[PDB]
Amino acid sequence: PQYFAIIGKKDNPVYEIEFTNAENPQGFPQDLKELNPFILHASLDIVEDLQWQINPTTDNCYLGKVDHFYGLAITAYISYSGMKFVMIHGNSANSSVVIDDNNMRSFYQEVHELYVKTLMNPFYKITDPIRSPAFDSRVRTLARKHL
Amino acid sequence: TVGPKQAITSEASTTYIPSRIYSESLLFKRQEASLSAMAFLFQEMISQLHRTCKTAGDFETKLSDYGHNIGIRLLELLNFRASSSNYITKMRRRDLKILDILQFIHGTLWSYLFNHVSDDLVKSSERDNEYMIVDNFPTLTQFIPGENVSCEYFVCGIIKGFLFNAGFPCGVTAHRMPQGGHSQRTVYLIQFDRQVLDREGL
Amino acid sequence: NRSQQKSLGRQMKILGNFQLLAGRYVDALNSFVDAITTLYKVRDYLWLGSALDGISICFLLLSYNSISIAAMQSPRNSIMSLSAPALNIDVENINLPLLIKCISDKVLYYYDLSLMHNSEYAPQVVYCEFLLKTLTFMTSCYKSSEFSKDVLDNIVKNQHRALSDIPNSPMFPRFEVYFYSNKLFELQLKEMQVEAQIKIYSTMAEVYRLLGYKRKQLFVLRLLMVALLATPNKIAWHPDYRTLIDTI
């Protein structure tokens, strides 16, 4: 299963989704209720620590697998305003983001384009969630076609 | 009904391709206007903010909020279209040193709002934690007569909300130093806070 | 066999040095006993215990897994305790790794970076010892695993490791490396006695607090809360829980 979230400035969330394969339809079995937001909020901090490092632990936008915990790796992207696109990947065996590392860099850039496109509405303040029906189709067609 | 904060919606991948509802575009398409049509709306900012304000200082710091809500939009646009979407690029540096974002604001923000690059960018040599940015001609305040510079601050709030959303908490203040034959030279001093100041040391 | 007499000496040597290593109390100040395994030396109880542990670890490394890793950890603890006293055991303690660099690989002369290399090799030797039966003694022949005693080695490894990071602009150990070297134990953690599980989460919270990681703290106190709730026995009020709920 895959968990994806857009974490704001004060760490308040603005987009919150999971998407998973049809083999296990009820995804993340007894982690989605009780560990899956805690590992996200706990491992915001190493992403925050990596925002002021010139070289990691000459792009500084994509970040690799930044944490690995029970065999679940997370990947991160620090945008220009500071909204961080952290996403947890889950599998059966040891999951590899290295098979998609060339791929899903153009998933983070193609959701950052959607965040910039929903920033320019002047009625949209900061620190309020994205209550957009267009945004869901615009992220899940990108998740279906490019994983 | 997509993200409520009551729950995280659990939805399976590889569904059907749904209908297409609203599609926009993001490149520049450099479309011009007349400076009279800008200055009329700028004086209609000020002709209401004179009306609903009691003293000078709260008029200053709520003319600044309008510039704040252009700066926090413009920071995400300008780097993203300068690093160049579906014409897939390699992204920009995401600058993180105080005289590497001052070069960016000095050479690109002023070349975006205005046609020219701003002329000079002056460190305060006799102390630290003041950083002057100047021009020779503020083209928005150029129809205001007199000398008081409260009507400046809509541009300086564009500076402040550029940096406050960039992770650099600062505070700007505009002044007027009529040097030479440029009678409207109009320095801004960016003045970063103390709690940022240790972090670039380490 | 020769391996049988070597196994007898391997059983003998580490325990024969361990009580003399445990014969130190407030650096052995004026405790003149009957002089049968209690020497009461002035400032050489650590030196005599270090010589005993050096001979014992040399004999166990000549008899080369579990007791070998315990012997190498005993030699590391004897070198660290002898260096903890401000004494002349510096060149002798650095050259006392004659079998420790033969079985392990220390290869350093710094302030416990040699002990960092010896501790990493000790955890590697205990990890090699994990490739065996789960419990090798008599009363530990049907125990839990080796997973209840690897964990006591690496938590005191972290407890000795993170104190090198004193906050200032020199960092003896980069800030990320013990954050890496505490996440290696994702053992199942399903069953053991509970008062180990309070203590591991409490000191893992304290090492995250002294590093300055204010959300990994919330993660490990949430694990402490979940471990406290699901215990089958009954517990009583104590004012530790008051300030625990206050800090969370």
UniProtKB/Swiss-Prot annotation, chain A:
Domain of life: Eukaryota
GO cellular component, one term: endoplasmic reticulum
Keyword Transport: yes
Keyword Transport: yes
Database matches in InterPro entries: Longin-like_dom_sf, Sedlin
Pfam families xref list: Sedlin_N
Compartment(s) of residence: Golgi apparatus, cis-Golgi network; Endoplasmic reticulum; Preautophagosomal structure
Keywords: Autophagy, Endoplasmic reticulum, ER-Golgi transport, Golgi apparatus, Transport
Biological-process GO terms, alphabetical: endoplasmic reticulum to Golgi vesicle-mediated transport; intra-Golgi vesicle-mediated transport; macroautophagy; protein-containing complex assembly; retrograde transport, endosome to Golgi
Family under the similarity heading: Belongs to the TRAPP small subunits family. Sedlin subfamily.
Functional description taken from the UniProt entry: Component of the TRAPP I, TRAPP II and TRAPP III complexes which act as guanine nucleotide exchange factors (GEF) for YPT1. TRAPP I plays a key role in the late stages of endoplasmic reticulum to Golgi traffic. TRAPP II plays a role in intra-Golgi transport. TRAPP III plays a role in autophagosome formation.
PANTHER family documented for this protein: TRAFFICKING PROTEIN PARTICLE COMPLEX SUBUNIT 2
Miscellaneous comment: Present with 1200 molecules/cell in log phase SD medium.
Self-association state and partner proteins as the record states: Part of the multisubunit TRAPP (transport protein particle) I complex composed of BET3, BET5, TRS20, TRS23, TRS31 and TRS33. Part of the multisubunit TRAPP (transport protein particle) II complex composed of BET3, BET5, TRS20, TRS23, TRS31, TRS33, TRS65, TRS85, TRS120 and TRS130. Part of the multisubunit TRAPP (transport protein particle) III complex composed of BET3, BET5, TRS20, TRS23, TRS31, TRS33 and TRS85.
Descriptive protein name: Trafficking protein particle complex subunit 20
Organism in which the protein naturally occurs: Saccharomyces cerevisiae (strain ATCC 204508 / S288c) (Baker's yeast)
Curated annotation (Swiss-Prot), chain B:
Main location: Golgi
One annotated GO biological process: intra-Golgi vesicle-mediated transport
Job description of the protein: Component of the TRAPP I, TRAPP II and TRAPP III complexes which act as guanine nucleotide exchange factors (GEF) for YPT1. TRAPP I plays a key role in the late stages of endoplasmic reticulum to Golgi traffic. TRAPP II plays a role in intra-Golgi transport. TRAPP III plays a role in autophagosome formation.
Keyword tRNA-binding belongs to the record: no
Note: Present with 8350 molecules/cell in log phase SD medium.
Cellular component GO terms, alphabetical: cytosol; endoplasmic reticulum; phagophore assembly site; TRAPPI protein complex; TRAPPII protein complex; TRAPPIII protein complex
Membership in a protein family: Belongs to the TRAPP small subunits family. BET3 subfamily.
Alphabetic keyword roster: Autophagy, Endoplasmic reticulum, ER-Golgi transport, Golgi apparatus, Transport
Coiled coil location: none
Cellular compartment(s): Golgi apparatus, cis-Golgi network; Endoplasmic reticulum; Preautophagosomal structure
Protein name stated in the entry: Trafficking protein particle complex subunit 31
A Pfam family recorded for this sequence: TRAPP
Source species: Saccharomyces cerevisiae (strain ATCC 204508 / S288c) (Baker's yeast)
InterPro entries associated with the record: NO_sig/Golgi_transp_ligand-bd (IPR024096), TRAPP-I_su5 (IPR016696), TRAPP_component (IPR007194)
Encoding gene, per UniProt annotation: TRS31
Subunit structure: Part of the multisubunit TRAPP (transport protein particle) I complex composed of BET3, BET5, TRS20, TRS23, TRS31 and TRS33. Part of the multisubunit TRAPP (transport protein particle) II complex composed of BET3, BET5, TRS20, TRS23, TRS31, TRS33, TRS65, TRS85, TRS120 and TRS130. Part of the multisubunit TRAPP (transport protein particle) III complex composed of BET3, BET5, TRS20, TRS23, TRS31, TRS33 and TRS85.
UniProtKB/Swiss-Prot annotation, chain C:
Top-level taxon: Eukaryota
Parts of the chain that traverse the membrane: none
Phosphoserine: residues bearing it: S66, S74
Subcellular location: Golgi apparatus, cis-Golgi network
Quaternary organization: Part of the multisubunit TRAPP (transport protein particle) II complex composed of BET3, BET5, TRS20, TRS23, TRS31, TRS33, TRS65, TRS120 and TRS130. Interacts directly with TRS65.
Function recorded in the entry: Specific subunit of the TRAPP II complex, a highly conserved vesicle tethering complex that functions in the late Golgi as a guanine nucleotide exchanger (GEF) for the Golgi YPT1 GTPase. TRS120 plays a role in the YPT GEF activity of TRAPP II in concert with the two other TRAPP II-specific subunits TRS65 and TRS130.
Record family assignment: Belongs to the TRS120 family.
UniProt miscellaneous comment: Present with 259 molecules/cell in log phase SD medium.
Protein name per UniProt: Trafficking protein particle complex II-specific subunit 120
Lineage, uppermost ranks: Eukaryota, Fungi, Dikarya, Ascomycota, Saccharomycotina
